Design a protein around this ligand. Structure first.
Ligand code: ADP
Ligand code: ADP
Ligand code: BEF
Ligand code: BEF
Ligand code: MG
Ligand code: MG
Lengths: 624, 624
């Protein structure tokens, strides 16, 4: 009554390069399994059980793996396998600050469709907690090395529950009963047998199965250093080894006797090669005793598996954005000191600059104070944004595992990550603008304050987007901080406030127009000097910091009369020598309006999110 | 013939706070074990087996744990347990880029003394690889999620081999046979039984022991939600449960039947409390049927355990510095792109500044170019040093595990970390100095170049030491980058090149003298302007960037005669108006010599290494 599926794999061969020689990890491994059955992979530690499951689960790179994997006779595509399969790896990889039932509820919201209501998604998480036996750990965090949460065997069954909350057609489990006691290992294999007999293909590895667990496994494959040495039912184990020449006693464990003989054969002079040839003869000796695949999968969705076209994702992208946003918010509530310290250093930076640059005046040094305040404020904004570099990098391995089997789109991840960080950028922009606008004494009134909040927000948005893009380009957090800090220094050097645009060499002026700091710095200057007739050098301040010494006030008026004699222009003591428009001409802030400078800063932020998404399309897979 | 040891623990009680209610993780757990025996801890997943071993291994915090742990009747001190014991945790935590035999050789060099030669340390690693059964994985890296190395069961026995290469008196193993096949689990317990019968106390947890493994265990303790439900020999297990009321059949597994009944009792109305009271009665019926501890430990060292005073560390601190330096060098050879990209961004920063600030001249703008070059060069040096923040943070959990049982002193770690990073700081200082000294055209000749290399090196040394100190203060890499970037900005703001020392407010001048950038920036300025009569403003450059417009050359001489009329001083066209000594007076670089400025920069680096060491003395323990 379930839809029949036959997963077949033939001649699987995998080689790695010793780093320059070659080592064969899988050697000509064939086998098959049907729905309704559990195929168990056995063998010693290091025999290739994780490699054989990595080959079948589209986890080793194309071109590296030889041989063919089919489903119902037709080639099992990598695009189809992400839709219908799930993989519980040998190691657990969970978000540490979420609890057990929060973790299983996020995976239920990723993998179950909108046709199932939220009350019935919660009933499936509660029923999965009860039958996996982790009720006592349900409100406990996962934890990590620094934070104690659940036990190791409890973390194991959370990883099983992440991938069995929906009902996939193919299920790969790398050692699901490792770290489990004998009665909870039996509970897990009874759960996996129920999923099997509902119409699934189960392929699992297992190390020390008891006679209770081994009776639930329908097919066994024994590995020995990448070779198959046994394939068949558990009941055919005494009949196999009696034909090989080493019969099993009735009082000993049959899998314990098998791996004892196999390890002894590994140390022999002739190897396991006599057993490998004998197993090939044993498989050839037992061969002497309509609906296409996309239709059979769609007929299986109609029966209840993977809860008619086959959608690659269970939910629309906006349902996935809503789920990914709530998990990022929940990871931020559990570590409140991350946003709390980012808010604290921005407020302290604003308070320090408020006391240092207190109520700047219309003077020649009040201009250089304004230019140096805005250069410092814009520069620490972009350097603050470098703390966003480990955000993707500590999520990246979990992101690779979840997107390998279509829990959410990678576009939904980029959209959700840009949405969750934006309320904190608003709080940092408001905290910096209210501590510095009225205390430094910036111009514009209320509309000048409003533009000031907007261009700080665009700076944080542009800077975070660029640091996010470089986090998707580098693999390493230390490589990334070396590169971000260097490029942010080059954005500062060619911004226009270290050296002017007229002094930048011609072969560097392309990088001046790609400076991320240039356009918000040019926007706060036009917001500050927005009165084109406001006087900044009244004409006795012509000799403020000239290389003549310090001069008396009456003799500075002697020079004002004397320099009037030689240039023609009459400079009295109240003649304005530099207006707000003159400051913007000397700094070179003349090309764009402050609104176009704000628009370019917003547009750089959108460009780098798209480039980060394109880097998630080309890279960030964890193959082999 | 081995020295007798009796480890006894009584009334162990541990409570955690649900985060506000309280949960009892260990409840009145007593028991004892002797040398020559293996005490096995059994129970379901989540019953407290890791917590019971964490209590005995001095791993949960003092005050949190109640009850007493003794050794030969005397209280097992935390200072003595670090010397005589070792702990294999449930999770593996190894350096991923080292191979298997490199990892075991570093642990042999940490734990075996100088009286054992290096040839005999290598023979003990080769013999440990053979009897743990990991010969095939010996030249393979450990790996991590991103880099495929050894298998999971191979990584397990590396973690066992790290703590059994020396022969400790007490050995705690949290699930050593998890992830292991049945024949290599038997090989590990036979190795642990050999260590036991040479005079060690073995306390291990185990989940699914076969009848082969269970015959090697002398004492069992069964846990059920923090309570002891069984203590005794494996042979007394059918006699125990026949007296409780549920006898065991002779054809079933005795530990499988026990945990089946215990889990059924957990779901009953009355709980396991009848079994917990029955086990207390069962222990009381079996009570009816000279050399002090420091002398007994010293008599055990002379027998060969922990290969007469008892040294807290196997090696002198300079042997530990030599071992820790080689492991850091080996981790850097395996990731050459870390140093390669740090060298590349420094060379590129030096090349960019060489083309931008090419061969600066004696002009008023050539002074501001020199001041802005040196401000930029010193600032990117300290911001480059922020990439040292994850160096301790990705090593910290391994550092906590190794120093918890005295593999090396924490002082040796601080000394080795300051020694390994110093050759790379020399290469970065030489790369920046040769790309910028001759191209920007700095003064001094060869001795000015030599001081220039020294003050860049002192800047890198001072900046790295401070970022290292802040890495020991924060727990998080994102918290640390938020704090380092903010404080490096405050060092820049109060350095003296954004605003002068005369313009810094009086309530901030204490922080100006604590600015790390101030003293190397003041040292390169006195190296540059080291000729006190070198002319930078000749007397036609008095009106270079004055607010008068651009002026013809003949009419600037009209002003020079006109400004000579009003001040008395005759300023001709060749009259020097600003010397190199005048530039240093205007910038405020007058207090210290450039050699004392270099000495303070070196001294700040030594201060922050000491403060990082003091933070490793007070914190960086991973308790509970
Ligand atoms: N990328 C690799 N490079 C070098 N050796 C490898 C690599 N992957 C695996 N080996 C080896 O292949 C063998 C089998 O790998 P694995 O599948 O993880 O074993 P297991 O049977 O425990 O699952 C191991 O000895 C392992 O060290
Ligand atoms: N710090 C903790 N906070 C809350 N619950 C905890 C904490 N530590 C353990 N628990 C719980 O104590 C129980 C036993 O812990 P553990 O010793 O790790 O179990 P195991 O028997 O598998 O070794 C687990 O259910 C675990 O979730
Ligand atoms: F779940 Be515990 F590690 F037995
Ligand atoms: F060592 Be493998 F994980 F069996
Ligand atoms: Mg494996
Ligand atoms: Mg545990």
């Amino acid at each position: 009554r379930p839809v029949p599926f036959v997963l077949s794999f033939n001649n699987l061969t995998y080689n790695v390069s010793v780093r320059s020689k070659t080592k064969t990890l899988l050697d000509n491994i064939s086998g098959e399994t049907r729905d309704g059955e559990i195929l168990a992979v056995l063998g010693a530690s290091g025999s290739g059980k994780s490699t054989l499951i990595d080959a079948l689960a589209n986890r080793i790179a194309k071109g590296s793996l030889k041989g063919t994997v089919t489903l119902n006779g037709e080639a099992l595509q990598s695009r189809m396998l992400k839709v219908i399969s799930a993989y519980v790896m040998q190691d657990d990889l969970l978000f540490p600050m979420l609890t057990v039932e929060e973790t299983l509820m996020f995976a239920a919201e990723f993998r179950l469709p909108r046709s199932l209501p939220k009350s019935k998604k919660k009933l499936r998480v509660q029923a999965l907690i009860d039958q996996l036996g982790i009720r006592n750990a349900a409100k406990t965090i996962i934890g990590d090395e620094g934070h104690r949460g659940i036990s190791g065997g409890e973390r194991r069954r959370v990883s099983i529950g992440i991938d069995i909350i929906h009902d996939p057609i193919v299920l790969f489990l790398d050692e699901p009963t490792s770290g489990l006691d004998s009665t909870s290992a039996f509970m897990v294999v009874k759960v996996l047998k129920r999923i099997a007999e509902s119409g699934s293909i189960i392929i699992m590895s297992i190390h020390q199965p008891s006679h209770r667990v081994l009776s639930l496994l329908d097919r066994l494959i024994f590995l020995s250093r990448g070779h198959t040495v046994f394939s068949g039912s558990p009941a055919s184990l005494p009949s196999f080894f009696a034909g090989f020449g080493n019969p099993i006693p009735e009082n000993e464990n049959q899998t314990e006797f098998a791996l004892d003989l196999i390890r002894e054969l590994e140390g022999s002079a002739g190897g396991t090669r006599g057993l490998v040839e004998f197993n090939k003869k044993w498989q050839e000796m037992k061969k002497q005793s309509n609906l296409t695949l996309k239709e059979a999968i769609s007929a299986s969705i109609s029966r209840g598996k993977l809860v008619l076209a086959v959608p690659a994702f269970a939910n629309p992208f906006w349902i996935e954005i809503k789920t990914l946003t709530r998990r990022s918010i929940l990871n931020s509530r559990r570590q409140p000191e991350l946003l709390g310290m980012r808010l604290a250093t921005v407020i302290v930076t604003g308070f320090i600059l408020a006391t240092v640059f207190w109520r700047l005046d219309n003077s020649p040094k009040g201009v250089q104070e304004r230019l140096g305040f805005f250069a410092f404020a814009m520069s620490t904004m972009f350097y603050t944004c470098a703390d966003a570099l480990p955000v993707f990098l500590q999520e990246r391995y979990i992101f690779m595992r979840e997107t390998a089997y279509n829990a959410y789109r990678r576009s939904s991840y980029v959209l959700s990550h840009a949405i969750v960080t934006f309320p904190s950028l608003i709080f940092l922009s408001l905290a910096f603008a209210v501590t510095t606008f009225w205390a430094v004494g910036l111009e514009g009134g209320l509309m000048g304050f409003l533009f000031y909040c907007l261009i700080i927000l665009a700076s944080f948005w542009s800077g975070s987007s660029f640091v996010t893009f470089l986090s998707g380009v580098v693999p390493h957090v230390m490589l990334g901080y070396t590169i971000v800090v260097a490029i942010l220094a080059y954005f500062l050097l060619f911004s226009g406030f270290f050296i002017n645009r007229d002094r930048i060499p011609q072969y560097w002026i392309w990088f001046h127009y790609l400076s991320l700091v240039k356009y918000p710095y040019e926007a706060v200057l036009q917001n500050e000097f927005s009165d084109p007739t406001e006087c900044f050098v009244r004409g006795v301040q012509l000799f403020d910091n000239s290389p003549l010494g310090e001069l008396t006030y009456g003799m500075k008026l002697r020079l004002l009369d004397s320099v009037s004699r030689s240039i023609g222009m009459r400079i009295s003591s109240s003649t304005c020598l530099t207006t707000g428009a003159d400051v913007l001409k000397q700094q070179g802030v003349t090309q764009l309006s402050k609104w176009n400078c704000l628009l370019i800063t917003v547009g750089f932020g959108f460009l780098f999110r798209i480039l980060f998404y394109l880097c998630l399309l080309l890279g960030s897979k964890n193959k082999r």
